[PDB]
Amino acid sequence: MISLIAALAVDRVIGMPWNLPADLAWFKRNTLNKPVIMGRHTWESIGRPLPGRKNIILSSQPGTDDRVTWVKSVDEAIAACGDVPEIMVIGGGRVFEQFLPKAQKLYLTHIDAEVEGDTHFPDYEPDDWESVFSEFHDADAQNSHSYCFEILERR
Ligand SMILES: NC(=O)c1ccc[n+]([C@@H]2O[C@H](COP(=O)([O-])OP(=O)(O)OC[C@H]3O[C@@H](n4cnc5c(N)ncnc54)[C@H](OP(=O)(O)O)[C@@H]3O)[C@@H](O)[C@H]2O)c1
Numbered sequence: 001m002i003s004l005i006a007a008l009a010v011d012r013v014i015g016m017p018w019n020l021p022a023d024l025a026w027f028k029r030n031t032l033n034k035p036v037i038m039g040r041h042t043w044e045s046i047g048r049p050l051p052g053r054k055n056i057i058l059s060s061q062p063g064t065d066d067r068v069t070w071v072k073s074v075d076e077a078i079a080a081c082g083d084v085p086e087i088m089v090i091g092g093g094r095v096f097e098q099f100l101p102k103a104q105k106l107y108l109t110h111i112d113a114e115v116e117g118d119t120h121f122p123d124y125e126p127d128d129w130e131s132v133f134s135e136f137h138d139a140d141a142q143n144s145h146s147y148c149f150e151i152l153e154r155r
């Protein structure tokens with residue numbers, strides 16, 4: 001099954017005006033040993049394959065890096081994962097919009113930061129997604145903002 005994972009600021013802004021090592025531990029635990037699907041802009045932003053994971057990059061043009069697996073469509077990305085329990089889509093905004101209708105699980109980090117960004121998470125509605133887990137953490141000496149881990153399953 002497909003799951004989206006992302007860190008959302010106010011107004012669902014994504015993509016780094018914060019410094020959250022605790023969110024990176026949450027991201028690493030939830031994606032480790034699972035294939036990750038990302039768009040090309042996300043891929044160039046990270047700049048390196050996420051270790052311990054099959055990296056699948058969506059792009060309409062031929063691949064330019066043999067360290068990862070390149071695909072040209074959503075169906076081809078899903079097929080490139082094979083038979084795995086859970087597929088993790090990690091961004092960006094354009095890729096999230098295509099995978100939201102097919103996802104059954106949302107891993108969200110709600111960051112209490114006002115950021116004027118030009119990329120947003122899709123507008124998921126409460127009647128389609130039911131919160132099954134929530135965990136707030138205050139801002140501390142290592143995390144620049146307060147944040148809230150949430151897991152939503154399709155109701
Ligand atoms: N390093 C960077 O380039 C970079 C990093 C961060 C942000 N930005 C900017 O910030 C904005 C954020 O964009 P984003 O986060 O929404 O990007 P994204 O989802 O991470 O990547 C979108 C790209 O993925 C490819 N793609 C997505 N779906 C596809 C499909 N079904 N079939 C084939 N290819 C597909 C396309 O690349 P192709 O163009 O190859 O088709 C598309 O341009 C972008 O407008 C960008 O200009 C750029």
Ligand SMILES: [Ca+2]
Nearest residue numbers: 125126127128
């Ligand atoms: Ca709806």
